[PDB]
C-alpha cells in the first residue's frame, strides 16, 4: 500500500490568490461561488502511514502540515512525520517551505545537481539553513536510474525529464539545463503499484505516454482549462504554453491525452485560481467528471493498493 | 485615527509550532486546552483604513492577508491593500513573506542599510525578486530621525535602536552593527496619538523608558513567561536573555517594567508557543489581566484615537 496525501492542490498563488479578484477569487470571497480554498501544490508519500516523504515544500507548508495529523506523530517533545523532502525543481513555490522547517534540521533533501546549484546560489537555501543544526543534507538525484529513501524502503523513485525552465532568479534561466525539471514515477515494490506524478506538464512525447501506460494512477497538471485562460480572466498576459502548462481543453490538451488511459485513475492537480473546474457548479467541472477525471482538493487521500497487471 | 491590525501574534514557529509537542502545542491539538492558534508576528498600520503599511512580512502572510478584508479592497482585477512594507530586522520569520508577494511587485520596502545588506547577500530577497517586475524598491531607514510613507501621510515613523543581533545566516552575525535591529514609534500627526512597537525587547534603558512614557499604546515583546521557559517545557536549551527577550516574570521582567506605565494601553505580542499566557485558563494569563495588560491574538484591532496629553 502506497499512501498519497494531497497537502496542496493549487498552482502558484493558491486559491484565492492574495492579490487576485478574478471571477473565481472574488466569487469565493463574496460567498457567491461554490468552491473550496486551496494551498499551493505539494504531496506527501508513504509506504506505511508513519514515515512520510514530502514532494515539494510549499510556502503554505505550516498550514498544510497542521491539517494532516500524521505529520505530527507526537512520539517526542520534538517530532515530525517528515522523513525526507524531494524537490522536482527550484521554483520559489516549491522550495520556500524549507525555510519554515529550519527548527527541525537536519533534513534529508533530494534534488538534482541543477536544482542544488540554484539553491546554493540564486536562492541559497542550503547555505542559509546550514546554520541551523547542520541544515539540509543533499542527496543527489541522478538524471538516469532510480532512488530509494531509507525511511520508506518500499518506495522506488524513478524521475523522468521535463523541458528545462529554470526560475527567473536562476543564474541559468537564459541557459536551461537537463535536471532543471522533472516528474516522478513512484513504485510500491511490494505490489508493483505505480504513481505517475507530473504537476507541471507542458508537452507529451511517445516515451512519456508509454511510461504512463505502465502506471496505475496519473496525477497530472491541471493548471488551466484553456491556453488563454489568464487573458480571458484579465489577470495575466502569459499563455499556457508560455508557462509550460498543457491546458485541459483543446487539441493536444490533457483531457485529450487522458482519453487514451481508460483504466488508470486520473487526477488533476496544480490548479490555477482562474480555472473554472474550481467552480463546483461549472460545466467545465462537469465535463471533467464525465471523462472519469478527478479534481484534486486539499486533504485528498489516494491509496494505491496494487498494480493493474 | 491610527488603525493597528494584529495579523500575527506568535513568536517564531507560530502556535502550535509544526514540530512541537510541548504542553501547549499538544494540548491544543488534543482539544484539551483552551487556546487560540496564532500565526507569526506581523502588524498592519493605517491612517485611513484603506492604505496599509505592513510591519514585517511573515511566512504566514497568505493566511494573514486573507483573514483581514481590507487587505483585498477589490478595486481592480489585481489589487491589494498593502502600500508599503517596513522591516525591523532581517530575520527569516520577518522577511520570508516577501517571497509570497512577488506577483504584486513593485513593492516599496523600508529597511536599514544593515538589513538591506543582509537581504542582498545571505538571504538575497532583493536580488531574487528584482526579476519580478522591478521587484522590491528599497527605501533606506536612517539611524536617526523619522520617515513618512506617502500612502499614509499622517503616520510619522521614528525608529529606535535595539541591541544588534544579526540572524544566523548573516555575513555579519559574529560582527553586529547598529541598524541590525530596531523598534518603532509611530505617531498620528493629526492627533499626536503614539504607538510604541517593540516585538523584540531584550533590555530597557532610561532613554527607552522616557520615550515609552510619551506613547499612548505599548505593544511589546511577550515571548516567554520565565527566562528558562524553553527548558522547563523541554523543547529548547537557549534562555530568554540568550534570545534577546525579556520574560514577563521576575526581576527586571516586562511586567515589572509595565508597572510604571499605568495610563498607557499595554499589549503583549510575539508570544512563544510555550508561554502559559496562551492558556486562557492559566493563572499566568489571569495575572497579566490583573495588571491591566492584554495578550494579543490574531485579528486583534487597536484604534489609537488621541494623545493622553
Ligand atoms: Zn483569481
Ligand atoms: Zn509547543
Amino acid at each position: 500500500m502506497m499512501y498519497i496525501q494531497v497537502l496542496g492542490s493549487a498552482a502558484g498563488g493558491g486559491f484565492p490568490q492574495w492579490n487576485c479578484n478574478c471571477v473565481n477569487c472574488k466569487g469565493y470571497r463574496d460567498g457567491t461561488l461554490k468552491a473550496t480554498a486551496r494551498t499551493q501544490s505539494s504531496i506527501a508519500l508513504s509506504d506505511d502511514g508513519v514515515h512520510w516523504i514530502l514532494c515539494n515544500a510549499s510556502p503554505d507548508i505550516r498550514a498544510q502540515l497542521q491539517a494532516f495529523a500524521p505529520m505530527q506523530p507526537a512520539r517526542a517533545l520534538r517530532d515530525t512525520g517528515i522523513n525526507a523532502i524531494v524537490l522536482l525543481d527550484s521554483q520559489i513555490d516549491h522550495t520556500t517551505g524549507l525555510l519554515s522547517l529550519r527548527e527541525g534540521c537536519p533534513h534529508q533533501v533530494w534534488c538534482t545537481d541543477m536544482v542544488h546549484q540554484d539553491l546554493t546560489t540564486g536562492f541559497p537555501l542550503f547555505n542559509m539553513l546550514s546554520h541551523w543544526n547542520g541544515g539540509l543534507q543533499w542527496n543527489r538525484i541522478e538524471l538516469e536510474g532510480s532512488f530509494v529513501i531509507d525511511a520508506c524502503p518500499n518506495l522506488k523513485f524513478t524521475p523522468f525529464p521535463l523541458r528545462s525552465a529554470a526560475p527567473p532568479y536562476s543564474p541559468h534561466r537564459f541557459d536551461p539545463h537537463p535536471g532543471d525539471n522533472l516528474g516522478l514515477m513512484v513504485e510500491d515494490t511490494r505490489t508493483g503499484g505505480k504513481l505517475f506524478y507530473a504537476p507541471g506538464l507542458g508537452q507529451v512525447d511517445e516515451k512519456l505516454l508509454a511510461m504512463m501506460h505502465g502506471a496505475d494512477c496519473l496525477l497530472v497538471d491541471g493548471t488551466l482549462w484553456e491556453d488563454d485562460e489568464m487573458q480571458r480572466r484579465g489577470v495575466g498576459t502569459r499563455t499556457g504554453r508560455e508557462m509550460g502548462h498543457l491546458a485541459q481543453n483543446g487539441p493536444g490538451g490533457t483531457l485529450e491525452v487522458l482519453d487514451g488511459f481508460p483504466r488508470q485513475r486520473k487526477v488533476l492537480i496544480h490548479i490555477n485560481n482562474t480555472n473554472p473546474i474550481l467552480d463546483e457548479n461549472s460545466p467545465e467541472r462537469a465535463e471533467v467528471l464525465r471523462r472519469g477525471v478527478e479534481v484534486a482538493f486539499d486533504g485528498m487521500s489516494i491509496e494505491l493498493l496494487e498494480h493493474h497487471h
Side-chain angles (χ1 to χ4, degrees), chain A residues 68-302:
Chain A
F68 188 51
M71 289 298 168
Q72 186 44 265
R75 300 162 293 197
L77 282 165
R78 258 58 172 76
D79 198 13
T80 180
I82 301 164
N83 285 90
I85 303 114
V86 174
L87 307 174
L88 297 196
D89 56 59
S90 64
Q91 290 166 37
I92 290 169
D93 291 342
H94 300 151
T95 53
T96 298
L98 289 169
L99 291 166
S100 289
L101 304 179
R102 68 191 179 282
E103 311 90 341
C105 291
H107 298 290
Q108 300 299 317
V109 177
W110 290 75
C111 63
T112 60
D113 176 67
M114 292 313 296
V115 165
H116 182 253
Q117 289 195 33
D118 274 349
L119 298 180
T120 48
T121 63
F123 186 16
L125 292 179
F126 280 87
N127 306 345
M128 290 171 63
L129 294 180
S130 64
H131 304 277
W132 281 257
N133 198 41
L136 311 176
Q137 312 295 332
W138 182 41
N139 296 264
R140 180 160 60 222
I141 299 178
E142 304 295 345
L143 299 187
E144 265 224 285
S146 310
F147 64 90
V148 172
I149 294 173
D150 287 341
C152 296
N154 305 104
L155 304 183
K156 181 178 170 186
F157 289 81
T158 313
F160 53 88
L162 296 174
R163 176 173 182 88
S164 308
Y169 72 79
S170 170
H172 69 270
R173 77 176 285 202
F174 294 159
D175 181 31
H177 290 123
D180 281 337
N181 299 83
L182 54 84
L184 290 179
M185 188 78 62
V186 192
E187 182 191 354
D188 182 343
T189 50
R190 293 166 305 193
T191 66
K194 279 181 181 174
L195 169 74
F196 176 87
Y197 185 52
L201 191 56
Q203 53 191 29
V204 292
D205 55 38
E206 223 49 45
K207 141 70 161 290
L208 195 65
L209 289 171
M211 102 174 68
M212 287 170 72
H213 271 111
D216 296 282
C217 178
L218 310 177
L219 192 50
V220 300
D221 189 327
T223 307
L224 313 175
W225 180 249
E226 301 275 1
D227 201 72
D228 74 337
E229 183 165 283
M230 227 69 49
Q231 293 105 301
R232 174 183 163 214
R233 308 298 213 182
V235 290
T237 57
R238 316 168 235 81
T239 73
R241 249 199 96 194
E242 216 154 2
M243 284 171 299
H245 300 291
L246 269 179
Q248 281 97 73
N249 205 14
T254 59
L255 287 184
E256 185 174 312
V257 169
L258 289 169
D259 271 339
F261 299 85
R263 337 179 287 155
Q264 280 77 12
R265 184 167 186 180
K266 300 170 282 284
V267 182
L268 300 174
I269 193 167
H270 191 271
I271 307 155
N272 206 46
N273 68 83
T274 52
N275 194 327
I277 67 179
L278 291 179
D279 180 354
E280 298 198 59
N281 286 320
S282 78
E284 290 84 2
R285 163 75 66 107
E287 172 68 4
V288 170
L289 301 192
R290 199 189 58 79
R291 300 245 200 157
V293 179
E294 303 166 69
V295 184
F297 54 92
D298 288 13
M300 180 185 194
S301 304
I302 297 167

Side-chain angles (χ1 to χ4, degrees), chain A residues 43-65:
Chain A
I43 66 172
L45 301 173
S46 186
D47 58 353
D48 69 355
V50 178
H51 302 95
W52 298 85
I53 299 164
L54 181 65
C55 297
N56 289 342
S58 103
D60 295 299
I61 187 166
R62 178 172 177 264
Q64 288 171 333
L65 299 183

Side-chain angles (χ1 to χ4, degrees), chain A residues 20 22 25 273:
Chain A
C20 189
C22 77
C25 292
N273 68 83

